[PDB]
Amino acid sequence: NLENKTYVIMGIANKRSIAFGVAKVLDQLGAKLVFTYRKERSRKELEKLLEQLNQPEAHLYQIDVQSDEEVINGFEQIGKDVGNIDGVYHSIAFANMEDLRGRFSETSREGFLLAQDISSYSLTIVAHEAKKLMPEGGSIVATTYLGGEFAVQNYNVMGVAKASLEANVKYLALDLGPDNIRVNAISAGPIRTLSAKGVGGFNTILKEIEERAPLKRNVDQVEVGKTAAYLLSDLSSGVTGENIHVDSGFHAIK
Amino acid sequence: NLENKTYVIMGIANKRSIAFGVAKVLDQLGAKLVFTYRKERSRKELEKLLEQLNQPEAHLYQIDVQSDEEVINGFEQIGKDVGNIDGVYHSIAFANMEDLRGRFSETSREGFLLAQDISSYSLTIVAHEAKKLMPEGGSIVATTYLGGEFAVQNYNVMGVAKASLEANVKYLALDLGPDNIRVNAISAGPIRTLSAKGVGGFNTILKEIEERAPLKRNVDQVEVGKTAAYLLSDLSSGVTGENIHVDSGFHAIK
Amino acid sequence: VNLENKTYVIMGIANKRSIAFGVAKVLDQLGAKLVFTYRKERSRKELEKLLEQLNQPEAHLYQIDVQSDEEVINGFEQIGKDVGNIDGVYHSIAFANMEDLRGRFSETSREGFLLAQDISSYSLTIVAHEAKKLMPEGGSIVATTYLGGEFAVQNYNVMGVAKASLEANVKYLALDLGPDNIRVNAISAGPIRTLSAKGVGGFNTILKEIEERAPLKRNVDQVEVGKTAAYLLSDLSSGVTGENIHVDSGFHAIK
Amino acid sequence: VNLENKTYVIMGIANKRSIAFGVAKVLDQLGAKLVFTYRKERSRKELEKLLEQLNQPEAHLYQIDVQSDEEVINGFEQIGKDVGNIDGVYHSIAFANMEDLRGRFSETSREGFLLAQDISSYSLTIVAHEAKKLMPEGGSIVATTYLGGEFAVQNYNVMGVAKASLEANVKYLALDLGPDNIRVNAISAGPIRTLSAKGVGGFNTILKEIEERAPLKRNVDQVEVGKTAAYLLSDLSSGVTGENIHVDSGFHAIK
Ligand SMILES: NC(=O)c1ccc[n+]([C@@H]2O[C@H](COP(=O)([O-])OP(=O)(O)OC[C@H]3O[C@@H](n4cnc5c(N)ncnc54)[C@H](OP(=O)(O)O)[C@@H]3O)[C@@H](O)[C@H]2O)c1
Ligand SMILES: NC(=O)c1ccc[n+]([C@@H]2O[C@H](COP(=O)([O-])OP(=O)(O)OC[C@H]3O[C@@H](n4cnc5c(N)ncnc54)[C@H](OP(=O)(O)O)[C@@H]3O)[C@@H](O)[C@H]2O)c1
Ligand SMILES: NC(=O)c1ccc[n+]([C@@H]2O[C@H](COP(=O)([O-])OP(=O)(O)OC[C@H]3O[C@@H](n4cnc5c(N)ncnc54)[C@H](OP(=O)(O)O)[C@@H]3O)[C@@H](O)[C@H]2O)c1
Ligand SMILES: NC(=O)c1ccc[n+]([C@@H]2O[C@H](COP(=O)([O-])OP(=O)(O)OC[C@H]3O[C@@H](n4cnc5c(N)ncnc54)[C@H](OP(=O)(O)O)[C@@H]3O)[C@@H](O)[C@H]2O)c1
Ligand SMILES: Oc1cc(F)ccc1Oc1ccccc1
Ligand SMILES: Oc1cc(F)ccc1Oc1ccccc1
Ligand SMILES: Oc1cc(F)ccc1Oc1ccccc1
Ligand SMILES: Oc1cc(F)ccc1Oc1ccccc1
């Protein structure tokens, strides 16, 4: 039960977004929500999606996490508008299509660093900026994937970025733990989203999970959301630095 | 909310048993509970404990996990008395105290096997027998410790048995996955319990955690129960074969 | 890597395809003195004829069933008299009932479970405690494990919990015996066509998945495990203890 | 071992305590031809004076700042022209601002973060791409990591995250280049008095924690690191790829 709580949800682009899964769950549970977006087309979508939710207000903020200024200023506004918050759901990554296929060894410098910036470094600065609105502590949750732990065909430059995000989560837990701020990851199973369209072999991935993972089935966004609710609430009070897989057991098998 | 759910909690010895921390969390949440004990000492401890809970009736069954017949007959009686269950919290381990100090290279065959039998195998037989009471799926959660993943001075025979338990969970997850039964482990930070009096240098454990772990404080049994509630419920659908550390982040630092 | 003046006990050759026979060809070729332990009379017969191919002056053959404290304590004691002090042990022993090696892991008997723990895991602890007696100036112990000790792999069932237990054992033995200058490590071998492999449901499927999916797109052999053993049993690995080296075409790094 | 007729590229010697200098004396001793790459004019000077301690008939030195694609591309193309095909590459290169090292991790700057990724992680990818051109029948690439890549350690901050990245790079490089017969691995070294260690808060208490807690209850040296390098860079390690072999007294194995 999340009444009185306020969460910032980062990275809804549309109805299939993992973060929109997160949103429905927290909304259903009683939370007040604030959404951040990058593209104009995403603000429009959010505008249309908020009619499903039970939020009396729409608290929408443009933040491109490639700019320090937009993060600093975006969180500063949030505080002025809604006050102190209880956590942040981070659902943000990017890579060029070029570097999500063929050969990892040909990734460009610029393409490599672009994925680190957006998909890993972004959590450090969000956490720093968010920390200023959690003086009594809170919870930060970032979205990860199996390709950060094992080399998987195609995910290429994103795997190295996911590996980097998961360590980020561990150094942030260590740093922020004395401020009563917990930092964890959800490692979601594969899911049909707009960003998945740039992961080569996606369909085959989806299928190899039905056939082989313990639950013999794929997970959806609402499942990411129910775990996110546990992480973002006091249910998970002893838990930090952790990486929960929501993937039907796939992580546990070979 | 766990109303009209039913869970079998295994291994409460006294007010301090981790498992009693599980029991309060689920009782609060509206679940019907059923308890199993090994020895009278606890039958009587349990009498008095359950007046602190809101269980309108006390369902208590004596099971020693060294006996197939008692594991088998116990669960059959549970079902005739209570119908189908939603899950099982397993909170049982044992070693001989000589094998919890000194040199691991000295462990006897009897002592080694005693710890595997009780602390590991028992989850297999329990899972086989509870499956019979979970025709529509359910959740099973065992209690493990960081000594299963790393060598820690003194824990010795228990560390190898805990590593064996944690694989036990992965192999049960894969097996029962297709029956909609999920199997996970909670990895609890150090807690002053009865069994914990048997481990060598347990005091220095507690303090090493306060000083060094990200949250810079110790966990308690209620913190286990809360996470156990997450695991035993629909919030963790899509999560199986997993091991959630509830240990102030200590698993994640070196 | 030069192995003259060095003596290693190899535990678990049964025939020419044994993984331990790979270890043996490498060690011998590097000039170490070898001492062999077997359980079944048939294994020794097989060792006797395999020895012809090695460059060993004499057979050092000892019957040790690791299920017996006496056989372990007396064999090591008897080895350390025939040859004196030693340098390392290659451990290569495991067993599970075939019933417990296919179908449903939730159906495993207590008996078959403890059987697998006893033979395939406990034996490491007691062998090291006896082997230590013969390594006053230090040494090196290596056991043999499988990816199934680290993930739930189909069919492998009771043995994967046994390997899980093997792995922690190696780590705990490393912590225990480090001050004594004794290292303890594991090789995690990819699937190899052997006698014990016959008991593992789905084996041909396993090998084929490696060829199709592991980074080297091929299967490894006994000699390849052998080569890494030499590393681990010798002073190139000084510094390395409690390690688990995967010799598997890189299969462990992918999903 | 036997590295006569092999040629390796060693990147990252700065002085006589460079970890890569460990690597070099072992390779040299094992009979390899060696080619060394450097960034700062001063390191080239130190190398020329370190080459005297080695059995190297010819000094092959190449200026390579891994921040520059054209510098890696041209240095490798040049190496190929002066020695022919090579057998492997020891990579031993990392960098981060003290500014970003001795802080609260959450206060790390963007440019600081990406500088560490660029130098310490991305450069393996490009080295590997250029080095492949000189390994038409295969080879071996080794990079140098640190336990701080697997858990959050005090003070390591920006570098542990770069190391986490380095450790994914190796796995992805391994999977991508396996078919070409190129193995790719890391050594996770324990701590060691080096020029670069001077950037790391609390280094003294880190050396002393290993001493009091790692199963060997002592610290390792460059030379130990080198001996595992030899194994990884040679055919001893043929089944092995995408591995992280820890040369740290067993510290990784404990809590
Ligand atoms: N779907 C899966 O199979 C899967 C599995 C495991 C983990 N994940 C992770 O889950 C997260 C969410 O992705 P998704 O699958 O839900 O896809 P998605 O709907 O396409 O969401 C990705 C989000 O990232 C945002 N984003 C990208 N660059 C940004 C920037 N520079 N500044 C601010 N926002 C930026 C996008 O915003 P704009 O559209 O406005 O640019 C978009 O809302 C990702 O980190 C992904 O790696 C996904
Ligand atoms: N406390 C910690 O720091 C810590 C940390 C991580 C994990 N754990 C785990 O938590 C679990 C419970 O331990 P605890 O700390 O709560 O101590 P506890 O209060 O002593 O509970 C241990 C329980 O094990 C039961 N038991 C032992 N052998 C049994 C058998 N053969 N058949 C049936 N029951 C048996 C005991 O019953 P009887 O009293 O009737 O003999 C007792 O109820 C254990 O699995 C332990 O490994 C503990
Ligand atoms: N084959 C693989 O793909 C694979 C992969 C990874 C790891 N491994 C491991 O490799 C190791 C060696 O097996 P392998 O494949 O080489 O098969 P193997 O040739 O069948 O060897 C197994 C050995 O175990 C011995 N053994 C079993 N119980 C014993 C006991 N109680 N006392 C003494 N010796 C006993 C057998 O001796 P007797 O015949 O004399 O009874 C036999 O020599 C095992 O640990 C296995 O788990 C195998
Ligand atoms: N020492 C340890 O405890 C420890 C532990 C684990 C792993 N490692 C790793 O071991 C490797 C070597 O470090 P070390 O401890 O031996 O220290 P070191 O001797 O100071 O070496 C650092 C090397 O990196 C080079 N380098 C930095 N930036 C470069 C660039 N942009 N282009 C080309 N070369 C560059 C330096 O060359 P220049 O001087 O020319 O700039 C120097 O040769 C590193 O990857 C380090 O992270 C060290
Ligand atoms: O991280 C992802 C994992 C996945 F399986 C499908 C989509 C995912 O998101 C992105 C993939 C590549 C680039 C950006 C996001
Ligand atoms: O497993 C335990 C771990 C721990 F840290 C404290 C108590 C725990 O319980 C037991 C310890 C030894 C034997 C049986 C139970
Ligand atoms: O551990 C094994 C792994 C493998 F793939 C093939 C054979 C293996 O050995 C045994 C399997 C079962 C029982 C004893 C040894
Ligand atoms: O990675 C290092 C680990 C260590 F323990 C000591 C030195 C290390 O090298 C560095 C190189 C550049 C910046 C930071 C550390």
Ligand SMILES: N[C@@H](CCC(=O)O)C(=O)O
């Ligand atoms: N014989 C095993 C499978 C072994 C194989 O086909 O490789 C079974 O019961 O199907």
Ligand SMILES: N[C@@H](CCC(=O)O)C(=O)O
């Ligand atoms: N003096 C170190 C930290 C203390 C230590 O050496 O342990 C520094 O440069 O901050």
